[PDB]
Design a protein around this ligand. Structure first.
Ligand SMILES: CC[C@H]1C(C)=NN=C(c2ccc(OC)c(OC)c2)c2cc(OC)c(OC)cc21
Ligand SMILES: [Mg+2]
Ligand SMILES: [Zn+2]
Length: 315
């Protein structure tokens, strides 16, 4: 109860900034997450003992893949923390609790392969879940871990508060399916521009939480250039492994995933910043003005990728 987590001074100050990098010391990431829960939520949200047992079971159920790993989980949670702390009064107690947990869990038991690859491989999960295949799995894994003995971090909630938070978490994890992002953001753009956006409308809240989840999930593009550039290496290491698996099924992969087309990466990143990242952080900045540093950092990295293309710097 009287047991604060504290961080060294540099981390204590930088963890509040959107562009914070959680660092290479894996053993500090649980501490960093608890620190964020405590400041975002309160020291009373969760029994420390239950929280710690939940964090470590979640960690254990992330795999040793190049990108979709435990470090991505904590990184995506830190971006949500940054959004929540810069928008203090907009979110309920339940939303603050559920969203940091949703981000920590959003890619549970990821294998480093897209929904598309599971569908073409004919993976059992593709028979169980026809759309948002991995995301329905991530939510399945979350509920599993919540139900292990000593792991119910929500035990103090009422029967119906408990249902509301698992419903926040489910929608938040499903929204990390980038195929759903495009329509979600179009709708939010129209609602905001015609003045119909209403944060008291639960179905509007839901859409706005989806957009945050996309923003937090993509936050690699919102770091300082050396972090952004080195992360893009992990990201493409998975894409090219999936590409190789596509070729093993006798399917030319899309160029993104083809390691024979490394030269096209800088132009691929341009498309991604223009078609996905900039639009995402633009609409997010329109709905939540204090998230503008995410849009500013994204724009800076687009400019760094333009420089890579003009040979004014090598990756
Ligand atoms: C969460 C988004 C993230 C990811 C881990 N996976 N999927 C795509 C993607 C996007 C759009 C797509 O539509 C073209 C797509 O095709 C299935 C795939 C992706 C592509 C990137 O660069 C190309 C990228 O660079 C930072 C980051 C991502
Ligand atoms: Mg995912
Ligand atoms: Zn993710």
């Amino acid at each position: 109860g009287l047991m604060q987590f504290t961080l060294p001074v540099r981390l204590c100050k930088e963890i509040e900034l959107f562009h914070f990098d959680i660092g290479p010391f894996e053993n500090m990431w649980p501490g960093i997450f608890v620190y964020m829960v405590h400041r975002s939520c309160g020291t009373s949200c969760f029994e420390l003992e239950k929280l710690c047992r939940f964090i470590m079971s979640v960690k254990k159920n992330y795999r040793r893949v190049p990108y979709h790993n435990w470090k991505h989980a904590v990184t995506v949670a830190h971006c949500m923390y940054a959004i929540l702390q810069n928008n203090h009064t907009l979110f309920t107690d339940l939303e603050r609790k559920g969203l940091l947990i949703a981000c920590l869990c959003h890619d549970l038991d990821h294998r480093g392969f897209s929904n598309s690859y599971l569908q073409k491989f004919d993976h059992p999960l593709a028979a169980l879940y026809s759309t948002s295949t991995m995301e329905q799995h991530h939510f399945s894994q979350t509920v599993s871990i919540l139900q292990l003995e000593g792991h119910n971090i929500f035990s103090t909630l009422s029967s119906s508060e408990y249902e509301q938070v698992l419903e926040i978490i489910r929608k938040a994890i499903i929204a990390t399916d980038l195929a759903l992002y495009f329509g979600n953001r179009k709708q939010l753009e129209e609602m905001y521009q015609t003045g119909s956006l209403n944060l008291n409308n639960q179905s509007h809240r839901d859409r706005v939480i989806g957009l945050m989840m996309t923003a937090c999930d993509l936050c690699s593009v919102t770091k300082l250039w050396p972090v952004t550039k080195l992360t893009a290496n992990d990201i493409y290491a998975e894409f090219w492994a999936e590409g190789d698996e596509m070729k093993k099924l006798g399917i030319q992969p899309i160029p993104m995933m083809d390691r024979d087309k490394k030269d096209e990466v800088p132009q691929g990143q341009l498309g991604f910043y223009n078609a996905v990242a900039i639009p995402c952080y633009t609409t997010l900045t329109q709905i939540l003005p204090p998230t503008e540093p995410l849009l500013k950092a994204c724009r800076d990295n687009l400019s760094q990728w333009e420089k890579v293309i003009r040979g004014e710097e090598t990756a």
